[model samples]
Target: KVFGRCELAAAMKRHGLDNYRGYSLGNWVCAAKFESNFNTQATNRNTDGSTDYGILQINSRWWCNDGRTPGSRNLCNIPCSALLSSDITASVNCAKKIVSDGNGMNAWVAWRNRCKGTDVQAWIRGCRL
Candidate 1:
């Protein structure tokens, strides 16, 4: 587990993610919660035969190399396993790059399905940034 909502908001702000690439801290926190519940080791297999890695659930089809997955774009230029590490710098950086590529948080299905239009303010409620 990585962080509770408040700590995560604080940490993300510290990392300059409070308003990164025009996306809000609430969007990031809400997506992370829905994606992996803040677990760094999270992984999911897609029906398309691709695997999503780490807290952001970046897909092997576009972001990282998973060996078994052929034709990965490897845009992050790192192994998919790197995303599973407790240190989330790589995953965070990759996510930033993904957003920079113009997808925004919409790249994550969880954000669209669960977080979009919801009152994400509660993601930062209480613990003081």
Candidate 2:
């Protein structure tokens, strides 16, 4: 299904991220906004002229390591489809575990601050992630 604003919001909620800091959804939205303005099919050209694909900008090389051939996985580790897949909640929960180990929320908070044009370090209080 083609994703729209409401779809994105629903996905965010499913991921358990607050969409912004001080909220209840995930913190990935800030990168989504900053990187591609939430374009699900967004792609970028690297300095070497290789194309970086998908929403999270997963490169083809990294994507191929996922046991999916570059073109088969839509040329990225987690395609937009996979990123917003039916298992979205589980995927994000796992990501949260890997990122914070159930402790630091600084990564989310920092990304949130960056979205607000604030310093990334603003969320840092010498706490380790």
Candidate 3:
């Protein structure tokens, strides 16, 4: 499912992306925008032979079990396919684990490239919180 910008915000907000682990909702929202453009089914194969799955673009190398990525830790202990759903609950939960595991939101380079040190609040402007 392709979510409208604010629609994604509303959904993620409910899942605790707002100020989760000191990262504001806008940071989370902005990261997802750059990661998958709010598309639930988005997937990208990485140059390292790992794959990123779902809206947050979580990697198969450390976060999920895909049976194809070597050295996979499956820290989230979930199938990578779980991230591709429109429901987004598991995706959000796994992302929380990623942040709490000390990667912070920097787990996704897209955030560092596009959102870090910027006014990420703009990503949620005009949206009902």
Candidate 4:
């Protein structure tokens, strides 16, 4: 039920991306916006039709089965959910891992980079809701 600009800001602050690659809070905002449309409660279907649940669109099938239901898996072990429930320091640390582990977010970033510009907003905007 948390929403609005202030809550969103607080969430970002908690995520430890406040310094976020040296571009200011806006960079983290941009990434979060690009990743989940600011919806802390978001999820998606995997390419193989698996239910990738949660804000960071993590495919729960990889972690746990607690989020196999619709409107319930808003906190899968994926990148986004992992950030929310975990400690801020731990979350950021995990984020760094996920983004550079060469097989997680790093792979994702590689895919995105090849697709086009970093215009994740544009990508989401063009998707079917």
Candidate 5:
């Protein structure tokens, strides 16, 4: 379930995440691009053995349940598979929870290391909305 940049941007706007938690849509778009390239089924095993889920790469350590990991806080109370859907509503909701938890976009290493402090407007370039 890979999405184009504009399609993702439109979805984020429709979900009221275009400017969620004071972060711009460009920021979110940039983060998503680096995180998973808008692939809903994206998953990755971390160096620490934790798994990352979905487009924003929500972590199993605090956000979702992966079953194999111990001490998963499951703050989002969702199965990691829930994030790997084309709908993306659950993923977006979980991302909102993450941003509200005080890390903002810093919760995503991709954002901190790549998208942050950079000109990310290109992420939304050519998108009418």
Candidate 6:
């Protein structure tokens, strides 16, 4: 599902990302826009020969299991295929788990490239949460 700004905010909030680990709704929303443009089915091949899955583009190298990436951690304990659905429940959980290591949102290259240090509040301005 491709989400509108407010809808994505609502979904994230519903999933417990709101103010989770000091990251605001805008932070996640901005990263989602950059990583997958709010599209749940988005996928990307990484230079490391791993793939990124879902809206936040959770990587198969360390998180989801695609059963192909060598020595894959499958840290999120979810099949990569699970993230392709329109429902973002699995992806949201993966994102939360990814940040649970104290790595925070820095695990996302998209976050580093754009969302981090930028005033992400603009991403959700006028959005009804």
Candidate 6 differs from the real structure by a C-alpha RMSD in angstroms, to one decimal, of: 1.0
Candidate 3 positional error at 50, Å: 0.7
TM-score (all chains, Cα) for each model:
0.92, 0.43, 0.97, 0.47, 0.96, 0.95
lDDT of 1 by residue, 12-128 (tens): 677777778877788889999999898888999988788998888999999999987876689999999999987778888899889888768889889999988898877887858
Q: Of 4 and 6, which scores higher on TM-score?
A: 6
lDDT of each: 0.85, 0.43, 0.93, 0.44, 0.92, 0.89
* lDDT of model 3, residue 62: 91
Which numbered prediction scores highest in lDDT against the true structure? 3
Ordered by lDDT, highest first, the candidates read: 3, 5, 6, 1, 4, 2
lDDT of 2 at 89: 45
Better of 2 and 4 by TM-score: 4
lDDT of 2 at 104: 41
If the candidates were sorted by their TM-score against the true structure, best first, what order would they fall in?
3, 5, 6, 1, 4, 2
Better of 3 and 5 by lDDT: 3
Q: Which 10 consecutive positions of candidate 5 have the poorest summed lDDT?
A: 64-73
lDDT of 6 at 20: 82
lDDT value, candidate 4, whole model: 0.44
- CA shift of 106, model 5, Å: 0.6
Candidate 4 lDDT tens digits, 1-129: 223434555665666655544324444444445455555555666655555333343444444344444343322244444544423343345444444434534334323543324543332333222
Model 6: CA > 4 A from native = none
Tens digit of lDDT per residue, candidate 3, span 1-129? 999999999999998889999998899889999999999999999999999999999999999999999877899999999999989998999999999987688888999999999999998999998
Worst 10 residues of 1 by lDDT: 7-16
Q: Per-residue alpha-carbon lDDT of model 6 for 54-119, expressed as tens digits?
A: 889999998989988988789889999999888889998988888887779999988988999999
The C-alpha stretches of model 3 lying farther than 4 A from their native spots are none
TM-score of 2: 0.43
